[PDB]
Write a protein that binds this ligand. Structure first.
Ligand SMILES: CC(C)COC(=O)C[C@@H]1C=CS(=O)(=O)C1
Ligand SMILES: CC(C)COC(=O)C[C@@H]1C=CS(=O)(=O)C1
Lengths: 237, 300
């Protein structure tokens, strides 16, 4: 059923699973028209499809041309997401296909279930966790590839860089969700924390800086402080 | 005008005939029901005084044979039987009619309620939903499960309603996923009407039979079937105009006949609110919407 704090270790067992987050599929800027009305302009989006055990990121870029001439775009975006996830699964070898797909928003359940009717043994699950995957577009290299796309495209990154060489997937996911929660709560401050020290660089084939184990502890501490602060600045406490 | 005689009434029982009912006391001199209108199916149904558990009954059509009721003390119920000897039946029925031991089917001449509830219901189709080919009449009770309920356990005692499942490959064309799920017209018109039922009359017959089994026996899977058949029409953008107008009449008389006190359990709030206020046909069921709003405004 629903994935929550109680069954959290299931994410890191050996049953293949994917999170699917659709919060950046349909993106717009709202602006005024010459007549003084309001209109939207779509920008490129992405489906965020993530294996939490391995760090695999199947980033399907949603080019604005997919919306051309379509109505009810927020509804269509859920079905387009489900179409692309189903296509990804069908593209994967049988032994690589997930046994479960966890959607981060319950409105994805029926679209995904219907597109996956051909896969009755793949469980489609909601979650009670409030995951911060919307902040994926605060990762500079992901934002860059999405905005530069001139056509539909799938791009494949590991969102954990090389962390699994040194830490477990539970700890890697905890680090990832902490980083993304911070970027979501105060993006400027979070990026200041991550890049303040010029001697620590991001490898060309990586998304995050090449911190030592000790530096990650410092970084992770600074991110918790940020989230607690903002929670202070927010509610005044 | 036909007659369903009773050998006796050895246990106290509330007897229903269509939308009517009466109480019979233990060993009361009751010998049956006369003046039953020819031309319609009918249902005779039973609720024992000592165990209100298990409403049960029989669907029949007097044009298809001479049917009688005798209590079986071993199986503990009133059973319908067919009497093959036409001359025995004529002589005994007459004798009982002469002793005024029979209740009269109490139809008001102005009253089309039963016609309106059974307009498309045919015995031949009932006997395909309720499979017991050695009898010309069909037994139904409160507990019988449907074929679809059993997929989600005795097949011989099941209600073989047509399976409707909105998240099924039958309902969803590959490559038309969003289209077919949000507008069920292809599932209604091609799969179900053209393919399975052949015409809207057979579809409405099954819808009306499902409602009547829900109402008279509290049969939960029948209620599920009735609502699914309503929702499949309401969720289709493209429905023949004659079907919409007929559905409105069908549902009107069903809502009119429902006991006010069973509305809480026989009516699914989600389906009705969706059908009357959100669906493609939200503006096509004027008679049904008006009676629902005046009779059951709480549900909405
Ligand atoms: C799409 C098909 C080739 C499957 O490919 C993969 O799964 C590659 C992994 C996915 C993301 S990653 O971490 O960059 C490596
Ligand atoms: C004992 C007698 C006075 C009452 O017995 C019956 O009425 C049983 C008959 C059997 C078939 S039938 O003809 O439909 C009725």
């Amino acid at each position: 059923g629903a994935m929550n704090s109680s069954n959290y270790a299931e994410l890191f067992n050996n049953d293949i699973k994917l999170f699917v987050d659709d919060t950046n599929v349909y993106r717009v800027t709202v602006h005024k028209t010459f007549e003084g009305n309001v209109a939207t302009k779509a920008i490129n989006g992405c489906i965020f499809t993530l294996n939490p055990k391995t760090g695999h990121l199947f980033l399907k870029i949603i080019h604005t041309s997919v919306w051309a001439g379509q109505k009810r775009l927020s509804q269509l975006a859920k079905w387009k997401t489900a179409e692309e996830v189903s296509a990804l699964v069908r593209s994967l070898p049988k032994e690589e296909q997930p046994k479960q797909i966890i959607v981060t928003r319950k409105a994805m359940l029926d679209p995904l279930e219907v597109h996956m009717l051909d896969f009755p043994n793949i469980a489609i699950r909601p979650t009670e966790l409030r995951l911060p995957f919307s902040a994926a577009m605060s990762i500079d290299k992901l934002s860059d590839v999405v905005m530069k796309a001139t056509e539909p495209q799938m791009v494949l990154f590991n969102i954990y860089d090389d962390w699994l060489d040194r830490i477990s997937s539970y700890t890697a996911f905890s680090r990832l969700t902490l980083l993304l929660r911070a970027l979501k709560t105060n993006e400027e401050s979070a990026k200041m924390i991550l890049l303040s020290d010029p001697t620590i660089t991001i490898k060309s084939y990586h998304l995050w800086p090449s911190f030592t184990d000790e530096q990650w502890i410092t970084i992770e501490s600074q991110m918790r402080d940020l989230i607690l602060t903002e929670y202070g600045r927010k509610y005044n406490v | 005008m036909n007659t369903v005689p009773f050998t006796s009434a050895p246990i106290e029982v509330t007897i229903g005939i269509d939308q009517y009912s009466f109480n019979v006391k233990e060993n009361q001199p009751f010998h049956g029901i006369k003046d039953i209108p020819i031309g319609h199916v009918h249902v005779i149904h039973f609720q024992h005084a000592d165990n209100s558990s298990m409403r049960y009954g029989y669907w029949f059509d007097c044009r298809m044979g001479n049917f009688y009721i005798q209590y079986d003390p071993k199986d503990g119920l009133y059973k319908m039987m067919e009497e093959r000897d036409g001359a025995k039946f004529e002589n005994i029925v007459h004798n009982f009619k002469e002793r005024q031991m029979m209740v009269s089917y109490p139809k008001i001449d102005e009253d089309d309620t039963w016609y309106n509830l059974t307009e498309f219901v045919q015995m031949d189709k009932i006997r395909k939903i309720v499979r017991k080919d050695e009898n010309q009449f069909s037994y139904v009770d409160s507990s019988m499960t449907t074929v679809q309920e059993n997929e989600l356990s005795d097949p011989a005692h099941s209600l073989n309603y047509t399976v409707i499942n909105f998240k099924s490959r039958e309902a969803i064309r590959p490559g038309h996923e969003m289209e077919d799920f949000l507008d069920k017209s292809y599932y209604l018109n091609t799969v179900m009407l053209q393919g399975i039922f052949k015409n809207s009359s057979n579809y409405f017959g099954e819808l009306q039979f499902a409602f009547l089994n829900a109402m008279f026996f509290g049969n939960y899977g029948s209620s599920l079937q009735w609502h699914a058949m309503i929702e499949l029409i309401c969720s289709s953008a493209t429905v023949p105009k004659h079907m919409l107008d007929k559905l409105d009449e069908i549902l009107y008389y069903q809502i009119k006949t429902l006991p006010e006190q069973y509305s809480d359990i026989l009516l699914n709030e989600r389906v009705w609110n969706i059908c009357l206020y959100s669906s493609f046909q939200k503006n096509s069921l004027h008679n049904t919407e008006k009676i629902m709003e005046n009779k059951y405004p709480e549900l909405l």
